[PDB]
Design a protein around this ligand. Structure first.
Ligand code: VTP
Length: 240
């Protein structure tokens, strides 16, 4: 339970935030300070009981406050969770109400504590790449299977985009739970659990763009029309 250096609520909110009655957002960060390799923002519409997930491309070309335009992934490296949150709020012009940061070990242990998570594997290409990645320690099979933590970790690490695999497994973890550092108390986290596990819909949205490589460093330049569309959708979802 770590607090952000920004106050009791997101500076982006114009009105007082009521955690238990308002729509809210959660930023999930996965780490191997370090760069963030999983960057998933989830917005929860309370009245509609819906969630929308968005993966921010790790190489997305964005302004990092205090550091200029750079890969999104570097925000956490330069200034930890606080700077990553600032970077997201500026990029999407929405509040990031909660943030959750997890490393490999926490992820694997969570999956194992849940007795694995269900994934429907569909690609021989992905299976072969994971075999290579893991020197054959992880051998997935096509079809619907329950993956242990080692297997799930390999699946979300291999480089369907990686961001999409991350969102897939994140939603699977939630489904299995029906059956690490953050900025809200465990009591509040647990208070949100019934809502989070009784959603009427779960959707994903995607930031599109193109490879931008001005001088031997790869960035992903965001399509600005799609970015504006995404911003409006998330702002509407949060009721801001
Ligand atoms: C699905 C949905 C609607 C909501 C789920 C998220 C929400 C809202 C949670 C609400 C708050 C709450 C109660 C949380 C309780 C905890 C809980 C149930 C889940 C916590 C989430 C969790 C365990 C992890 C979140 C992050 C995720 C999805 C995956 C972590 C992956 C990870 C640790 C690391 C990934 C690192 C990756 C992908 C690559 C690094 O590999 P590399 O550097 O060798 O290779 P490269 O550099 O060449 O690429």
């Amino acid at each position: 339970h770590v607090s952000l250096a920004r106050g009791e609520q997101s500076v982006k909110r114009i009105k007082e935030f009521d955690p238990g009655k308002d729509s809210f957002s959660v930023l999930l960060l996965g780490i191997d300070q370090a760069r963030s390799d999983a960057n998933v923002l989830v917005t929860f519409n309370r009245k509609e009981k819906t969630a929308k997930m968005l993966s921010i491309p790790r190489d997305a070309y964005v302004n990092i406050p205090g550091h200029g335009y750079d890969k999104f992934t570097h925000a956490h490296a330069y200034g930890g969770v606080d700077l990553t949150v600032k970077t997201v709020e500026e990029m999407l012009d929405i509040p990031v109400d909660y943030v959750v940061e997890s490393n490999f070990t926490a992820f694997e242990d969570v999956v194992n504590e849940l007795n694995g998570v269900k994934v429907t594997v569909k690609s021989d290409k992905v299976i072969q790449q994971i075999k290579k990645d893991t020197k054959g320690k992880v051998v997935l099979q096509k079809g619907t299977h329950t993956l242990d933590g080692e297997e799930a970790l390999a699946y979300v690490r291999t480089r369907l985009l990686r961001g999409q695999r991350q969102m897939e497994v994140l939603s699977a973890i939630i489904d299995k739970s029906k059956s690490l550092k953050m900025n809200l108390s465990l009591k509040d986290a647990i208070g949100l659990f019934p809502f989070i596990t009784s959603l009427k819909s779960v959707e994903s949205i995607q930031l599109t763009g193109y490879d931008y490589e001005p001088a031997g460093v790869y960035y992903f330049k965001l399509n600005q029309q799609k970015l504006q569309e995404v911003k409006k959708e998330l702002q509407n979802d949060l009721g801001v």
